[PDB]
Structures are given as C-alpha cells and as structure tokens.
Amino acid sequence: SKRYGEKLKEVFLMLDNNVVECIKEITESSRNGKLVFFVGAGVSTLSDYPQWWRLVDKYHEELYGSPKKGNYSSDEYLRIPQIFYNVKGEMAFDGILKDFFQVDKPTNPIHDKILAMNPAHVITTNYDNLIDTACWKRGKYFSVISAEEDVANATSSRYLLKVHGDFRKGFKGENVVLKEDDYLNYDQNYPLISNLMKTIIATHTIVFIGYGLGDYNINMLLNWVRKLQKDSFHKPFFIRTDPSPIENETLIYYENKGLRIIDAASLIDSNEYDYLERYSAVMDLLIESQENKFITKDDEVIDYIYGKISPLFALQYIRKIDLKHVFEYDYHFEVNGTVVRHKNKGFGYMERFFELKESCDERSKLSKKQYERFNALFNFFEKNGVICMAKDSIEINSLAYHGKYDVMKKFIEEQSVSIEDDYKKAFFLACLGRWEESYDLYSNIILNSINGCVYYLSQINRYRIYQSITQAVTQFNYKPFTDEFLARIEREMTNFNIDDLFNGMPFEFQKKYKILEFLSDNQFLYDDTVKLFELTNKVSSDIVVLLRLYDNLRFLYENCLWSVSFHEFHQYIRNSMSLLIEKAEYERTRDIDELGFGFFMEYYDFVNISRHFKIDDIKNLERS
Amino acid sequence: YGEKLKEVFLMLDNNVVECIKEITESSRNGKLVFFVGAGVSTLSDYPQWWRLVDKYHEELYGSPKKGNYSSDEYLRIPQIFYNVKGEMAFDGILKDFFQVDKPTNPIHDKILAMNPAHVITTNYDNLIDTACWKRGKYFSVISAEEDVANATSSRYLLKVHGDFRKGFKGENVVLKEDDYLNYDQNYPLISNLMKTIIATHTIVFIGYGLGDYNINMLLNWVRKLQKDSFHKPFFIRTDPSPIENETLIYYENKGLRIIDAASLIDSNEYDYLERYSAVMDLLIESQENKFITKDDEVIDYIYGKISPLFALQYIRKIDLKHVFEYDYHFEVNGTVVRHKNKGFGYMERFFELKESCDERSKLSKKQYERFNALFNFFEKNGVICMAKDAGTLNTSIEINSLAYHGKYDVMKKFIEEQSVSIEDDYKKAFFLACLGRWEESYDLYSNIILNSGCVYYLSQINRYRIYQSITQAVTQFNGYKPFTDEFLARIEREMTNFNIDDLFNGMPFEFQKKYKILEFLSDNQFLYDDTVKLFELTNKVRSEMSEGSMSSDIVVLLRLYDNLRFLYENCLWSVSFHEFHQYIRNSMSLLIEKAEYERTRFFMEYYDFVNISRHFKIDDIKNLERS
C-alpha cells in the first residue's frame, strides 16, 4: 500500500510534461464540475463481466455447430449476431442474451475511482448495471438514461447516459445496440440519446476510459469531431491501458485527430495481463493529483493556497468557519487563529506556508511571482487573524457598527470612485434608513457589475432591503415610501427566487465563492444557535462561542451585508449573549458555593447588547 | 385590465387551462425554456428582415418590387446581392440597417419574469441580452460555435442564428439562403445544443407565425423522433385572426400545443402588443394560482402535496408549513392558521369536507379514497381543524416505537426475525443501531441502500450517522476492540468521499420537491427552529417566573413530543445525537421549573420519565433537585 504510494509519487515526479498538463487539466475540470467520463468495455471486463466475443462465439456455435477456426474480424463481431438474428428467431437471440448477461458481478475499484473523480455526467457504451450499482452505493444519484423516452423525463441534472442501452427493461436485444443492424440504424433509432451525448461532449471535458484506440465508438466520435469547426471544442482525453506502449506514430496521428492520450503502459511497467494495474495507475495518478499528494516543493503550495484564497481578496473579512469550506475541510480553523490538520491526506501545504512565514530564508527561495503571491497571502492571513498551527482581541472596522452616523453621511455625500465604494454607500444608506436610495444604488451596482462577487452581494442586499421595506410597510399600516416606488419594486421583485441566485452565477464563481452560498439561504445561523447548547451544560465553550459571535459580527459588518439588521441575527446575538452571561453567573454561584469567596464585558459587548437586546431582554438579564 | 385578465381566466378553455398549468409547473421546476421569435423583437420596432430585402432589391434591381415577397425570395434576394455586389456591400447595408439602439418591449421583461431555464432565440439582436442585463438575470450568451464550449454558466441564451456581437458582418449571422442551406454544416454544436435543450426542457414558442421556416424545421426534426418520446412544445400564436380549427388540428397532431392569443382576448388587428401581453400575463399571474375551484380539486391538490409523506410514519407539524410553501401555519396543538394563502382556501375546504359528510359524499370515487387517506393522515398526525373552529384540545401523546420504550427483548426478537419488506429492513437496521451492534446495523443499512425514494435517502443519512458514531466510539475507546480494523478500513474507504451536505442536492428533483422537509435531517438545522423556540419561551417563562402572573409550557412540551415522535417513529439515528439529547434535557428542565412554579399557587407522566431517564445526566438531575 505505502509502497504503491511511493511508486506513484516517483512516477509522477518522472512524468512527461504533456501528461502532467493533461492531468492538471483533468483535475481542474473535475474541481469545476465539468468532467465527464466516457466508460468503455474495459472497465466492465475488469469486473469479469461477460465480454461480447463470448456471445459471438455462442452465436457462431449455434449457427454452425462449431466455434470458428481462427479469430473474428471487426466486422464479424457485428455480422455473426446479425446472421443469428436473421436466420434464427429473435427469441433465441434474446434467450442467449438472457443466459449470458443475467449474472451478478461486483463493481471493480475503477468504478469507485471514476466516481471519486466527481464526474458531472457518465457516458457509457456498456449495457451492464455495474456503474449504476457503483453510483447507487456511493450515494451520488445519476439519472440513468438508456432509452429514447428516458431523455424527456430526466429526474436529475446529472446523467448516467447509456448510449447503447441496457437490460433494465429486460434482457432483450431490442433494448441494446449489439447487432450490425442496430449500429446501422443507431442514428435513426436513438436521435435524442446521440444528440445528448454530443451536447455533453461539446459542453464538458471528456475522459475516455476502457476503450481501445481502434474501437468503433472512438472512431465514430472522432469522425463526428472532424465535422466541427477548428478550435471550437475541447480535445477529449483518452486513457489508454493496452499492455504495450503506444507507438509514436499512432500517438501523433490520434492526437492530431483531437484525442489527448495518456498511455498507461508508458507511465508504469506492468505484466501483459495486468489491465487492472494500469487502470488503477492512471486513475490513482489523477486522484492523488486531486488530493494534493504530489505537491512536493515550495512555490507550489503558494500557488494552491493563492488559487484558493485570491477570490476572497475582494471580500473584506472571511469567517474562520468559512476557511474550512474554502479548503474543503482540509484544515480546522480555530477562532483563536490556530490551524489544525483535519482531513487532507496529501501534502500539508498550510504547515509549509506557516514555516515559510516564520523563516525568511526559506521564503527567499521562492520565485519572484510566487514571492509576491506569498506576500499577498500573508497579508490576507494576518488581516483575518490566522497566526500559526495549533502546535505553535476583536476589532471591527466598520463605521456602521460603531454608529458613526455623521461619517456615514459624509461618505455618502462624496462621489464614489469604484463599485465597491458604491456597495459601501448603499449599505451605509440602508443603515441610515434611506432604503429607497439603498435599493436604487443596489440596482445600479447590479447593472454595472457585469469575479462578480460584488454583483452577487448586491443582489442579496437588494432582496434583503426589499424584504425590509415590505415588512416596514406591513407594520406601518405614514407613507415613507411612495406608492409608485412600491409598485416599481414589486414589479422588479416578482418571481425573483433568491434560492436560485447562486446557481445562476457562473460556475467559476460557484467554485471560487462557495462560502457565500449561505448568504442566499433563508436561515444561516442554525449551526451556531445549535452549538449554543454547550453553554447550558452544568457539569473553553464560552470563549469559542464569544469568538464565533465576534466573527459573525465582523463578517456581516465589514463586508456590508444588510442581513445583519434582520430579526434572525438579532435573535442569535441575544441568545448567545444571554447564554454566555447566564453561564458565567452559574459558574460564579457554583464557585461561591464550593469556595465561599465572572464574565468580563468590553466595548463590543456593550454595543452588541445595546443594539440587539430589547428592554425586556435586558430586564430578564438583570433579573436572572 | 387585470380584472379583464381574470375574466379571461374564468372563460378560459379547459385545454388552455391545462397548457398554462404545465407551463407554470415547468417554470416552477426550472425546466421552462422560452423560444423567442422575430415578433417579440418587432414589438420593439426592430428593423424587420423585409426592410433589408427591400433595400437589397433596390440596390441590385434598381427599383422596389412591385408585388409581395415570397418565402424563398426573403432568402434568395439577399443571396443574389451577396453573390453579385459582394460581401462588403452586404455587410455595409447590414451595419447601416442594424446598428440601432431600441428599447426592450415589456414582452421581454414578461418572458424573463417566468424564470426560463434557457432562452433560445432566432433573433440576431441584443434585445434579450439587454433585458437580461437590466433585470439582473445572468445568461451565458451563445451565438457562435466556440461559445458552446466556453459557456460560463449552466443557463444559455442560445442565438441559433448568431448575432452582431463580433461585428456587423453577414458571416456572423444566418440571413441569406446559403446560410440556411449550410446551417447544419456551419452550426453543428449550436444545433445540437438547441435540440438537446428542446428534448430536455419544456419549450414555449413566442414570436413565430406558425409558418416560419424555423418552426417547420423543428417540426420536421420532431417528426423523426420516436412516438411519445418527447414533450410537445408550446406555441404562443399572436396573429390577429383566430386560428382555424383545421389548422389547429393539423399543427397539434404535428407535435405542437397551441395557445392562441386572438382566441383568449379580442383586440384590434394591429394591436400585437396587446395580444402578446395577454398570454404573457395569463402565464405570469397563474404562477401563484393553484387552479382550485371545486372540492375534488382541493382533494387532488392536497393529496398531491401529502401522498409522498405517506412513506413516513409521522411528520412534524411545524414542518408542514414547509410542505404547503408557507400557505398555512400548522401550530403544534393541531390548529391551522391562514398565513400566506392568497387564493381559494383549500385547507378550510378540506376541514369543511371533514366535518360534514354531505360534501364528502358528493365526491368522485378516486377523490373519495384520496380524501379518506388524507383524513387518516391528518388524524394520525394530530391535525384537528382550523384555529377559529378549534375547541378544547388535550395534550395526548403516544410514540409507537419499540426503541423509545426500551423493549430490548422484543427489540432482539424482531432483530432475529426475518424481514418481510424493505421497511422492515429499515426498522431492523435502526434496531441494530439502537442495540449497540453498529457493525450489523451499518451492513444492513448498506444492504437497504443497494436494494432500493424516501427509504434510500433516509438509509443514506442513517448509514452516515452510524459511521460517524462508530468513529467517535473508536476514538473514545482508544482515547477494548469492539470493531475489527478491517471493518474500520472498509467503512473509512466507503464513507470518506461521501459528503452529507450535498446528499439532498444529489437527489431527483421530484424527491427534492416532494420531500423538502427531509433535507433538514442532513444537518442540525432540523433542531434549529425548536431550539430558537426553546430559548425564547424559556426567557418568557422566566419572566413569568418572577412577576407572578395557550400556555408556553404547553407549546414547549408539544414541540418536544413532536420532535421525539418524528425521530423515533421514522427510525432515524439522530436520536443518538448529543445536540438532540441537550435539546430534550433543556426542554425537560424548563418544563420541570414551570411545574415547580405552578405547584405553589401539570404532572410527571410516563413519557416524561422516559425522556428524563434517557437524555439526562446525573449532574443535571442533581441540579433539578437543587432548584
């Protein structure tokens, strides 16, 4: 196991530059969710599924009473079943298919690797259910499309597209593409499936696995690709697992045809019959490239952390709990600024980054561009209060939080020099009650903002301020807002679904700014409200709760989000502060009981209590 | 005008009502794609193509045509001009005729207000682009072949005939006859994408004259498709004269569902904007409408909303407001309150049918059985009637789960018994989890997953939960070898890639619509509202603790019982969570404090004793004794 990992790392370090670039593109596409796997028959044979040549042999035996002397050609594989279908009855064909294919076979680890690569869709020429079984086990639901009618009623947005059909309806030759007749009339009999396959191939990054370079489907797809306009499509990737290394002439010939070939035999040395070894070699190379197990040098951890962090440079402050989602739970980011390795199995890039931060000599060894990127990363991390790993005071910079109303008015009066200044102006106007002007400014920003994170935040804030205006109008019934303005906002906000706002953003934004998705949710503080129960235990929790409250407040104020003014956030602040004070009082009473002679509140605590607590809530706090 | 549209709704034909129903359903599901023709662009006074044909005719022949242009002439005359006068003159005329800025008509905004999944347009103008940019709707605009691969979003604005974004050249658009002849060869990717979108969405045709070249080409392509292997596209016809019955029959048999604007409303034969706005508004204003007029419709709609929940043994009442999209508040005592139901009141009608047998009798047999099933569901879920009609209500609770009562002997007896159906397997897996045999519990849950959509999703969540608890138990023990290291390795291999957050998203949209309330089980959001509730009444009770003044304790107790019944009767492993136990402990502490106050001026029951014995620690009981 460990020897296999060391061998894989050695192979990657000696990998060709072209194969390295192909692996990088495949991993990037998988991260973006644009990856699709075209699964061939080799993956099925890896699970000992009955190969088609066995069926051809059975049909030949039934036709002539003896297996053919020699080897079938490519045309015979489709002709002999056709001859059996014609001269013999269709019932015999279907019965032989049932006798040969109604078997139960386990799913090979290659299916698990393909699924762990996170493909958007899976296109397969296999008529078996092995990939269906693997997807069913792994919990990723795929809309299995194997007939013409399945295309119209597709349940989900991700497809298990069996372009050659399967035996779900039954072990009948009419449901699959086996005979030469089926291949001849495939376009006529499967228009929708072929169109869907071509659309998926055009709109996604295709990786071919389980196919030979001389396969019928591969050549047909290359012929169709030949019809496309030059450079109007992405060249599909082809994983070649044949025992012998691919010839250079064949390699260049097929690369000119549009296939970027990663050849398993060229990467590692394996036995002639060890197909699973080569399949696992390629798939594991891709997976450990995804898992960052091949990052072995500095100025490369810098690139990865920069790719993860640089989109967040637009945002003023990032919650520590958001950094967990930024790195996909690779590290736990404690509120006190300490980082802990949590779930990453590859290189410890955060530890290397902190080592670079601590010692200047190792930092100097980086490249110039990587040195500047590290400088930006260090500024970002120190600004967000990330210091070092576990083994090694709140401050909110927002005029709205401190109630500097005159300064907010002054900032509003000046002329904005950037879109971010307009965003801050709109938030300040919202905090000052000028909600009509806030809505107009947010609409203007939305118009002029198409990273596009300011656009998303402006849409969120505009919906929030529209809800605030609606609730104020409902509770008032004075006319602070003209009826024309109310009608205009109603006509603008009708059928406006905030739930689909994030999904309508570009997928590059949806990958770079996953941590903002919670802003479109109706409720986003359920987690902290739930962990507030630890303060009710009667048997540190208080400091982490207070620091998380400070993190939420700083994120909502520094980034200028109107959701800070809603009832849910006020309720969360009230509950957290009340529970903290009650727990401190309980600790004081327990100590005075056991000893016989707690909470230290600061300016920020006073501001939070003043802004979020009602008079009744403060009365309850004093009474209890 | 709005009341005129309501009158049109009243006089709407049955088939038109059905078509509007499917269109609104597709819009709600996000599978609606709008096919915008040239009439919509013409509504904004955009230069029509016949003006360009006239200009080419004048430029080459020297005089305007005496008669009327035939269909082939619209493509032949520009082709002749391109062949003779060359490409430069063609592009110059195209530029001087098309580089105009035109305001977006309200029809564009009405199309966008339907939230289309995609907008396929034969127009080469940027009017839809401007409308999307103004409304704030982001659409990846695709007008060339290279734009298909470089799409920035999953929602496409597909200009199948191109546009002038690259420039005002004839090569960027499909105008002349040669462009239409070589369209399949010149635009393979765009045509493939259009065909795929049509196949995988609901298409509404707006702006076409039912005789356009594109409409007939799509009909010809549809003809080749397998019978009943596709959904019939909708065609909005906005011609002044009402469509003939024969023509309507001919086109409907060809794979079109035609909504005629001239049939719905009467307008002047030059008032095209009125004709477009009538159908667009009738589609828009039906988004909120549920098309509920008669009692059988009430029964059918409530059955459609409730029947997926028949798989679950019990449903939290507070969750029901999510089922009906916040139309009604379902209070914990069994009372319903009108919250956001703007249309006809189907819950009031259902209760009226329930109380009096006369209206229940005058129902269809299928609808009678549906109403009977709904009555059984609501009676078993504790929903009684509306708030106004509600009288005396008792806090009677029962939990029909062996795990809650701790019938460990019966637990093991049913465990050893052979399972009958997949529900029995699910219950047996929950019993294994409750019995401390998490190994066989995980194996049985994986077997249920393999053999399997409510049970599939519930078993996935339960399997993840027992994997988590196994990890925690192993960490605690090593921080005794209950589990073999081989089992730990296998479960770690199976579960490390699995993510519980996106499990609901990786579910069929039918499941994500029918079983929305189940999504909360993925995270602790399931306990959110109650927790928030559990806090506020606490403070309120504490206020009533000191000033000495339905009951708040009743609401807290009912929410507690609802949570317990939902988590136990549905056989969910979340009953073993620390957060859930803390919630139960806090609720019981508050209830006991209220009881202590009320005594010196409610009683402990069996279920209360079970909850205290299960979810409390010794220190909490000591604190309760002290206070």
Author numbering:
A (entry chain B): 8 to 399, 406 to 463, 467 to 493, 504 to 565, 579 to 636, 644 to 670
B (entry chain A): 11 to 462, 468 to 494, 504 to 573, 578 to 629, 645 to 670
The authors write:
The recently identified bacterial Sir2 domain-containing protein, defense-associated sirtuin 2 (DSR2), recognizes the phage tail tube and depletes NAD+ to abort phage propagation, which is counteracted by the phage-encoded DSR anti-defense 1 (DSAD1), but their molecular mechanisms remain unclear. DSR2 contains an N-terminal Sir2 domain that serves as an NADase effector responsible for NAD+ hydrolysis, a C-terminal domain (CTD) that functions as a sensor for detecting invading phages (as discussed later), and a middle domain (MID) that connects the Sir2 effector and the CTD sensor. DSR2 forms a tetramer with its C-terminal sensor domains (CTDs) in two distinct conformations: CTDclosed or CTDopen. Monomeric, rather than oligomeric, tail tube proteins preferentially bind to CTDclosed and activate Sir2 for NAD+ hydrolysis.
We initially determined a 2.6-Å cryo-EM structure of DSR2 in its apo form with approximately 60% density observed, which facilitated model building. Subsequent 3D classification allowed us to obtain a 3.1-Å cryo-EM structure of the apo form of DSR2 containing all parts of DSR2 density. The overall architecture of the DSR2 complex assembled in a tetrameric state, forming a ‘dimer of dimers’. Four Sir2 domains are arranged in a central core, adopting a head-to-head arrangement, while the CTDs are positioned at the periphery of the complex. Protomers 1 and 2, as well as protomers 3 and 4, form a basic X-shaped dimer through interactions mediated by MID-to-MID swapping and Sir2-to-Sir2 interactions, resulting in a total buried interface of ~4200 Å2. The two basic X-shaped dimers are further organized in a head-to-head arrangement via Sir2-mediated interactions, with a buried interface area of ~2000 Å2. A structural comparison among the four protomers revealed that protomers 1 and 3, as well as protomers 2 and 4, share similar conformations, while protomers 1 and 2, as well as protomers 3 and 4, exhibit distinct conformations. When superimposing protomer 1 onto protomer 2, we observed similar conformations for Sir2 and MID with a respective root mean square deviations (RMSD) of 0.205 Å and 0.373 Å, but substantially conformational differences for the CTD with an RMSD of 3.763 Å. Specifically, the CTD in protomers 1 and 3 adopts a closed conformation (CTDclosed), while that of protomers 2 and 4 takes on an open conformation (CTDopen). These conformational differences contribute to the recognition of invading phages (see below).
